[PDB]
Design a protein around this motif. Structure first.
Motif, PDB file in Angstrom:
ATOM      1  N   UNK A   6      15.062  73.685   3.477  1.00 30.72           N
ATOM      2  CA  UNK A   6      14.135  73.998   4.556  1.00 30.72           C
ATOM      3  C   UNK A   6      14.680  73.603   5.924  1.00 30.72           C
ATOM      4  N   UNK A   8      16.505  75.692   8.035  1.00 31.46           N
ATOM      5  CA  UNK A   8      16.289  76.798   8.946  1.00 31.46           C
ATOM      6  C   UNK A   8      15.074  77.629   8.593  1.00 31.46           C
ATOM      7  N   UNK A   9      14.099  77.011   7.927  1.00 34.55           N
ATOM      8  CA  UNK A   9      12.881  77.701   7.522  1.00 34.55           C
ATOM      9  C   UNK A   9      11.795  77.610   8.588  1.00 34.55           C
ATOM     10  N   UNK A  11      10.390  77.326  12.248  1.00 34.66           N
ATOM     11  CA  UNK A  11      10.934  77.846  13.496  1.00 34.66           C
ATOM     12  C   UNK A  11      10.832  76.834  14.634  1.00 34.66           C
ATOM     13  N   UNK A  16       7.070  69.356   6.054  1.00 37.91           N
ATOM     14  CA  UNK A  16       6.481  68.348   5.183  1.00 37.91           C
ATOM     15  C   UNK A  16       6.089  69.029   3.877  1.00 37.91           C
ATOM     16  N   UNK A  24       6.536  75.535  -0.139  1.00 36.25           N
ATOM     17  CA  UNK A  24       7.197  75.297   1.136  1.00 36.25           C
ATOM     18  C   UNK A  24       6.182  75.396   2.267  1.00 36.25           C
ATOM     19  N   UNK A  25       6.335  74.535   3.270  1.00 33.87           N
ATOM     20  CA  UNK A  25       5.258  74.323   4.224  1.00 33.87           C
ATOM     21  C   UNK A  25       5.804  73.747   5.523  1.00 33.87           C
ATOM     22  N   UNK A  26       5.310  74.268   6.643  1.00 33.99           N
ATOM     23  CA  UNK A  26       5.709  73.837   7.976  1.00 33.99           C
ATOM     24  C   UNK A  26       4.547  73.162   8.696  1.00 33.99           C
ATOM     25  N   UNK A  27       4.855  72.622   9.875  1.00 37.14           N
ATOM     26  CA  UNK A  27       3.882  71.940  10.725  1.00 37.14           C
ATOM     27  C   UNK A  27       4.108  72.426  12.150  1.00 37.14           C
ATOM     28  N   UNK A  28       3.187  73.240  12.661  1.00 33.22           N
ATOM     29  CA  UNK A  28       3.324  73.766  14.011  1.00 33.22           C
ATOM     30  C   UNK A  28       3.052  72.682  15.050  1.00 33.22           C
ATOM     31  N   UNK A  36       4.916  80.430   9.472  1.00 34.36           N
ATOM     32  CA  UNK A  36       6.162  79.701   9.669  1.00 34.36           C
ATOM     33  C   UNK A  36       6.359  79.286  11.123  1.00 34.36           C
ATOM     34  N   UNK A  37       5.252  79.119  11.859  1.00 31.82           N
ATOM     35  CA  UNK A  37       5.214  78.705  13.268  1.00 31.82           C
ATOM     36  C   UNK A  37       6.006  79.668  14.158  1.00 31.82           C
ATOM     37  N   UNK A  38       5.557  80.925  14.175  1.00 32.09           N
ATOM     38  CA  UNK A  38       6.240  81.972  14.918  1.00 32.09           C
ATOM     39  C   UNK A  38       5.381  82.645  15.979  1.00 32.09           C
TER      40      UNK A  38
ATOM     41  N   UNK C  14      -0.935  73.019   9.663  1.00 32.90           N
ATOM     42  CA  UNK C  14      -1.431  72.081  10.659  1.00 32.90           C
ATOM     43  C   UNK C  14      -0.881  72.447  12.031  1.00 32.90           C
ATOM     44  N   UNK C  16      -0.077  71.082  15.478  1.00 35.76           N
ATOM     45  CA  UNK C  16       0.104  69.853  16.235  1.00 35.76           C
ATOM     46  C   UNK C  16      -0.208  68.646  15.375  1.00 35.76           C
ATOM     47  N   UNK C 351      18.313  84.180  15.911  1.00 40.81           N
ATOM     48  CA  UNK C 351      18.991  82.964  15.490  1.00 40.81           C
ATOM     49  C   UNK C 351      19.513  83.008  14.061  1.00 40.81           C
TER      50      UNK C 351
END
Ligand SMILES: *[C@@H]1O[C@H](CO)[C@@H](O[C@@H]2O[C@H](CO)[C@@H](O)[C@H](O[C@@H]3O[C@H](CO)[C@@H](O)[C@H](O[C@H]4O[C@H](CO)[C@@H](O)[C@H](O)[C@@H]4O)[C@@H]3O)[C@H]2NC(C)=O)[C@H](O)[C@H]1NC(C)=O
Ligand SMILES: *[C@@H]1O[C@H](CO)[C@@H](O[C@@H]2O[C@H](CO)[C@@H](O)[C@H](O)[C@H]2NC(C)=O)[C@H](O)[C@H]1NC(C)=O
Ligand SMILES: *[C@@H]1O[C@H](CO)[C@@H](O)[C@H](O)[C@H]1NC(C)=O
Ligand SMILES: *[C@@H]1O[C@H](CO)[C@@H](O)[C@H](O)[C@H]1NC(C)=O
Lengths: 41, 563, 568
Positions: A6, A8-9, A11, A16, A24-28, A36-38, C14, C16, C351
């Motif tokens: 993770x 480059x997963x 953005x 976490x 698979x999981x992101x945090x914006x 994926x916070x895009x 989440x 922030x 990118x």
């Protein structure tokens, strides 16, 4: 915490990991949104 | 099993000897009658065994002027009444009366949607007054018209003691009516018994057997495969997820009061699935290259359309006169019908109605397709056949004369038919009566002209066999399998040889003859005349003169010219 | 009435910190009833308030409750869950993993008005402390279509919760107080109708299109509609305008018929949607179709000839799962003229993605999108290379319909760029959506566009703030234009005035097209002087060409063919 898969997963976020979901999981950040916070506000 | 029903309001039958035969051919095997269950002018000794499976009648049921003992409508389930005889009447029994209707014996009939009951002038029926018609009628038309005859002139037995309520149809024990409206409890529409559990589904109209929505006796709106609901599923399902438009593979077509897989011939399909007889404006009847048709939208002008009888331009007039002969000028596909009444050749003073001429009937030479019926009942002494309609190819028959016939010939001096290019009769029947000059009626292949199993020939009161053998009324041997139209050698529907200009001949003049003709796969046509005749060989091959092995005067690479 | 709530598409994510996501959840879902997106209640701590969730009536998507610490989520007036989007491809209500290190999470969840879920299923798992939800049956809610894939478990370990209310049948209560039990409408009901029922009477059940119960047999006395919604009633399909007629056998006007735009039935389609033959306001027409207007409103007809190619875009059809256009799908938009979908220019494309194994995008490959002319949805632009100063890749972009909008509000989103001019020289009409310009670095020339004469759809605003500053583009290198209308200028180049003073030949403007001291002679036509017949001899201090045609000259060049001037 996430592994090296993770790097480059996410953005504009930090990866976490959840135990029960086990996916698979992101945090914006502030001003960022999406799966994926895009997307922006 | 789809029969369209007759349209005889009160008029006499055209052929009383084959009227019961017409009812036997058209009303046998029917289960859902799309039109009107009309039984007019039936005398005694009438085998009415064809009425043993008719359950649903979408129009009005009219039993009038019949001298039969009884009409077996025990299996009649529901009368919808989309069309009505009078303004507010659906089940009218008039002037039936030794003969006369003894008992109606309407066992399973318990729902009439729109209309009323007209029982009058029937001095042979007992129980016309003791029927609770409020139990049968719908709630919105509970203030209907319930005119019931009073005079009977015959005292008969009372009802059967095994069922109570004193609501019986006849004298049999199984022939008494069970209530379906007043016996219910609460706000039930229809119910089997007095219990609230025995109430029916809200789409069941004529009762039910179980509480489910797939086992009504006769449900209301649109049946398909048993499961019937309010609206029939259309061909395009509108999605609300991404607001797209997806066609429905499981969407059926709307056909009357039910929904089938695909509605049959002489029903033009539309975009909404509601197939019917005629299409609305801004539409053109096209071919879907499968034997069926489906009209769609057209361009902006969409002119050059021909109208006939039973359309926007022709409603009141029935006879083709000189007042509307200009409207049938040069059109090849008449939307409507053509009827030749006996008043079309009469001179009525002070009405500007001039009689027709035989030279004025030549405008129908380019006609190929008639969407309605052909009712010819008057013909002058000019020419004894139908050479003015010799190019008529197909008759659709969506509009029928009295709802039952498409090709009707009455009182004519016609000797042979002459319908050469007639290859398909869509709907209706064929009736030729009181025509003592027409002999070639049974030699026509009527079985190959039909597209439905409920179609048959009804011939009576015509020229017999004895006036056709000694007179030599028989055509040549060119017509194969006895399929012949007229005594001329140009009216074979299928001959074993080729066609020299729409005419069956013996042999094409290839090896013989002073002109030369090339061999087509079905026809036999002449090529260019300046090809050199080969004595004892195949002379001509194609229409262009380059394919000849030799020509007459001048040899040029494109063709051969005399100058 | 019935304030439309947009919804989110950020499953479990989440935003922030915990307080930042709490403020974003308070800001996003405030004062809204019908949620077209996804009600996703995530990351709520112990001592916070969720009183704004009481006004939500129905959610079109899936309800996603996960990772919460608060003891009460007031989803009281949540009537019906439509389920237009799935999480695990069959599930709608997924209350999953609401616990703490003390195993104290969501204690109670009184979903009182929840009576029917149309699409999806229910999965409950990982709830250590949970009051009375384990007694709630779900055969009453979930029908027999999606009964197979549903599964749930309940592990109440040291919950210390009180007894349920025995005043309601079958022991199914949501909370613990009065009138807090499940209004079950399926198992204690008659099988004489397939719809719902308000009582135990067999003849007092609801309409076929009434879901989640009703308040009467009449279709007006009904809470929500099942599939299609009518104005204050529920029908199966609202009829079109021109119906049949048993009297005149022609087309007759509608007694109660309306168009079909989504679930509800409106009277008129908006100006950017397609009117079909079935009377439904659709976004995209059929595959073998040709989108072209006939009388004012946009329609589609059956295409004839080759019927070459329609462009699906991003988000619908083949590329629903993708999130941005990249080097993989750039070959499918070569000979494209109409974008019948959405576009996403994101920084993930410039990118490279090692997860999905995609090469980095060449910035020279943006000239493939020159051929297209219109975009039906929204244009999301969030990334741009740091060398080019104008967005000339959409130079031939004529009209933006705005059928689909980013978060239901914005259509032309040019944010976080490195440009000095928008460069949309052919942007003449925007049918729907808002245009936001924010977060940029050196992008002025935005307040002098006068967007009020661009869109015609009422109820729309604009938002341009904090890009360059009013005093930063004061210098001589940064000016709008001189001697042209102040209605609109796009960049410093003189081909960017929207309306010019005299001369509007092509995409550019000059002082004047010379009829006295110039070799091209151009007659003025609607303030757009164009080149006349090239074989016409120019005069001396006179009007040479009058109109479009060789018959508008005094003296011909070579030969005279009547009034015309020909070459031979
Ligand atoms: C560049 O553009 C690419 C498209 O042209 C894009 O590729 C997409 O990547 C996504 C992320 O993995 C995929 O979801 C997407 O489609 C997938 O294709 C798979 C077959 O190869 C399918 O098996 C897959 O089905 C399921 O996948 C997951 C499994 O959990 C589910 O979440 C999903 O909903 C579905 O059920 C899925 O269909 C893929 N598209 C194509 C056409 O290959 C790529 O990501 C882009 N690169 C970027 C933006 O950096
Ligand atoms: C609704 O349509 C179904 C399907 O055609 C009808 O069921 C048929 O009824 C006839 C009656 O004689 C039977 O001969 C057929 O065998 C039946 N079809 C099947 C597939 O079993 C049904 O009668 C119609 N009417 C109602 C009220 O359900
Ligand atoms: C939410 O709406 C209410 C309604 O008046 C308002 O008082 C409150 O301030 C709003 N919340 C936010 C964060 O703006
Ligand atoms: C849900 O159940 C259906 C059975 O109707 C099955 O085909 C499908 O695979 C299941 N799972 C889903 C949709 O994830």
């Amino acid at each position: 915490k996430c592994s090296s898969d993770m790097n480059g997963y996410c953005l504009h976020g930090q990866c976490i990991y959840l135990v029960d979901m086990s996916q698979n999981y992101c945090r914006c950040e502030v001003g960022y949104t999406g799966v994926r916070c895009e997307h922006f506000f | 099993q789809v029969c369209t029903g007759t349209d005889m309001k009160l008029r006499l039958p055209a052929s009383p000897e084959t009227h019961l035969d017409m009812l036997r051919h058209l009303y046998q095997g029917c289960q859902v009658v799309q039109g009107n269950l009309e039984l007019t002018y039936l005398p005694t000794n009438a085998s009415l065994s064809f009425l043993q499976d008719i359950q649903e009648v979408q129009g009005y049921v009219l039993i009038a002027h019949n001298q039969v003992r009884q009409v077996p409508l025990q299996r009649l389930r529901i009368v919808r009444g989309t069309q009505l005889f009078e303004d507010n009447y659906a089940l009218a029994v008039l002037d039936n009366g030794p003969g006369g209707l003894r008992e109606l014996q309407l066992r399973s009939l318990t729902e009439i949607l729109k209309g009323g009951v007209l029982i009058q002038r029937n001095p042979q029926l007992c129980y016309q007054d003791t029927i609770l018609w409020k139990d049968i009628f719908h709630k919105n038309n509970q203030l209907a018209l319930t005119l019931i005859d009073t005079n009977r002139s015959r005292a008969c037995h009372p009802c059967s003691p095994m069922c109570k309520g004193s609501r019986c149809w006849g004298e049999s024990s199984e022939d008494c009516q069970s209530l379906t409206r007043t016996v219910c409890a609460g706000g039930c529409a229809r119910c089997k018994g007095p219990l609230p559990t025995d109430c029916c589904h809200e789409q069941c109209a004529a009762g039910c057997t179980g509480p489910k929505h797939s086992d009504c006796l006769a449900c209301l709106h649109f049946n398909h495969s048993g499961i019937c609901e309010l609206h029939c599923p259309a061909l395009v399902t509108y999605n609300t997820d991404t607001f797209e438009s997806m066609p429905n593979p499981e969407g059926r077509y709307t056909f009357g009061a039910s929904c089938v897989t695909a509605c049959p011939y002489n029903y033009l399909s539309t975009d909404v699935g509601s197939c019917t007889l005629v299409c609305p404006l801004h539409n053109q009847e096209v071919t879907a290259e499968d034997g069926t048709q489906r009209c769609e939208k057209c361009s902006k002008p969409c002119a050059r359309v021909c109208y006939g009888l039973g359309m926007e331009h022709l409603r009141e007039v029935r006879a083709v006169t000189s007042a509307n002969i200009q409207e049938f000028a040069g059109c090849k596909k008449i939307f409507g019908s053509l009827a030749f009444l006996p008043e079309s050749f009469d001179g009525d003073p002070a009405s500007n109605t001039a009689p027709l001429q035989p030279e004025q009937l030549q405008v129908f030479e380019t006609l190929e397709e008639i969407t309605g019926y052909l009712y010819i009942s008057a013909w002058p002494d000019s020419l004894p056949d139908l050479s003015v309609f010799q190019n008529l190819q197909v008759i659709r028959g969506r509009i029928l004369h009295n709802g039952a016939y498409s090709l009707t010939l009455q009182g004519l001096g016609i000797s042979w038919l002459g319908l050469r290019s007639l290859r398909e009769l869509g709907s209706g029947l064929a009736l030729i009566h009181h025509n003592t000059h027409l002999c070639f009626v049974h030699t026509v292949p009527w079985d190959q002209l039909f597209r439905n199993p409920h179609q048959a020939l009804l011939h009576t009161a015509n020229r017999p066999e004895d006036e056709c053998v000694g007179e030599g009324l028989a055509c040549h041997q060119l017509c194969a399998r006895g399929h012949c139209w007229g005594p001329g050698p140009t009216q074979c529907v299928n001959c074993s040889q080729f066609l020299r200009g729409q005419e069956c001949v013996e042999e094409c003049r290839v090896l013989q003859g002073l002109p030369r003709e090339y061999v087509n796969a079905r026809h036999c046509l002449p090529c260019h005349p300046e090809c050199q005749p080969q004595n004892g060989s195949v002379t001509c091959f194609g229409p262009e003169a380059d394919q000849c092995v030799a020509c007459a005067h001048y040899k040029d690479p494109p063709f051969c010219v005399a100058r | 009435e019935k304030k439309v709530c947009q919804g989110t598409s950020n499953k479990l994510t989440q935003l922030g910190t915990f307080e930042d996501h709490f403020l974003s959840l308070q800001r996003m879902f405030n004062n809204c009833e019908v949620v077209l997106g996804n009600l996703e209640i995530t990351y709520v701590q112990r001592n916070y308030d969720l009183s704004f969730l009481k006004t939500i009536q129905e959610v079109a998507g899936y309800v996603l409750i996960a990772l919460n610490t608060v003891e009460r989520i007031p989803l009281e007036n949540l009537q019906i869950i439509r389920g237009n989007m799935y999480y695990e491809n069959s599930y709608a209500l997924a209350v999953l993993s609401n616990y703490d290190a003390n195993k104290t999470g969501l204690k109670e969840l009184p979903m009182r008005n929840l009576q029917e879920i149309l699409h999806g299923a229910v999965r409950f798992s990982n709830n250590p402390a949970l009051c009375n939800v384990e007694s709630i049956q779900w055969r009453d809610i979930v029908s027999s279509d999606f009964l197979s894939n549903m599964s749930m478990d309940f592990q109440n370990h040291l919950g210390s919760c009180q007894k349920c209310d025995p005043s309601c049948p079958n022991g199914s209560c949501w909370g613990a107080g009065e009138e807090n039990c499940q209004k079950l409408t399926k198992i204690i009901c008659a099988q004489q109708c397939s719809g719902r029922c308000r009582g135990k009477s067999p003849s007092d059940c609801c309409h076929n299109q009434c879901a989640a119960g009703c308040t009467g047999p009449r279709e007006s006395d009904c809470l929500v509609c099942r599939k299609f919604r009518d104005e204050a009633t529920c029908k199966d399909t609202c009829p079109p305008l021109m119906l049949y007629n048993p009297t005149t056998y022609q087309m007759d006007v509608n007694p109660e018929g309306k168009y079909s735009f989504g679930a509800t039935c409106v009277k008129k389609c908006p100006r950017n949607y397609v009117v079909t033959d079935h009377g439904s306001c659709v976004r995209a027409c059929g595959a073998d179709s040709y989108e072209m207007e006939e009388d004012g409103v946009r329609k589609c007809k059956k295409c004839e000839g080759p019927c070459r190619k329609v462009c699906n875009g991003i988000g619908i059809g083949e590329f629903k799962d993708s999130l941005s256009i990249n080097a993989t799908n750039i070959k499918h938009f070569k000979n494209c003229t109409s974008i019948s979908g959405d576009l996403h220019i994101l920084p993930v494309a410039f990118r490279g993605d090692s997860f999905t194994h995609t090469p980095p995008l060449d910035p020279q490959e943006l000239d493939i999108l020159k051929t297209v002319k219109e975009i039906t949805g929204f244009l999301l632009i969030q990334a741009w290379p740091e060398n080019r100063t104008d967005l000339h890749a959409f130079e031939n972009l004529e009209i933006i319909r705005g059928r689909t909008k980013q978060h239901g509000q914005f259509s032309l989103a040019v944010v976080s760029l490195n440009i000095t001019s928008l460069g949309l020289r052919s942007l003449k009409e925007i049918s729907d959506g808002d245009v936001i310009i924010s977060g940029n670095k050196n992008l002025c020339y935005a307040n002098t566009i006068n967007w009020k004469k661009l869109f015609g759809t009422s109820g729309q605003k604009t938002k341009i703030i904090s890009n360059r500053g009013e005093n930063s583009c004061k210098a001589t290198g940064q000016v709008c234009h001189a001697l042209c209308s102040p209605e609109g200028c796009w960049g410093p180049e003189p081909r960017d005035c929207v309306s010019c003073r005299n001369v509007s030949r092509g995409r550019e403007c000059v002082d004047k097209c010379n009829l006295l001291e110039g070799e091209p002679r151009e007659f003025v036509e609607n303030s757009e002087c164009i080149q006349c017949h090239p074989e016409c001899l120019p005069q001396a201090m006179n009007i040479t060409c009058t109109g479009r045609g060789p018959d508008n000259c005094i003296q011909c060049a070579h030969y005279i063919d009547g009034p015309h001037c020909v070459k031979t």
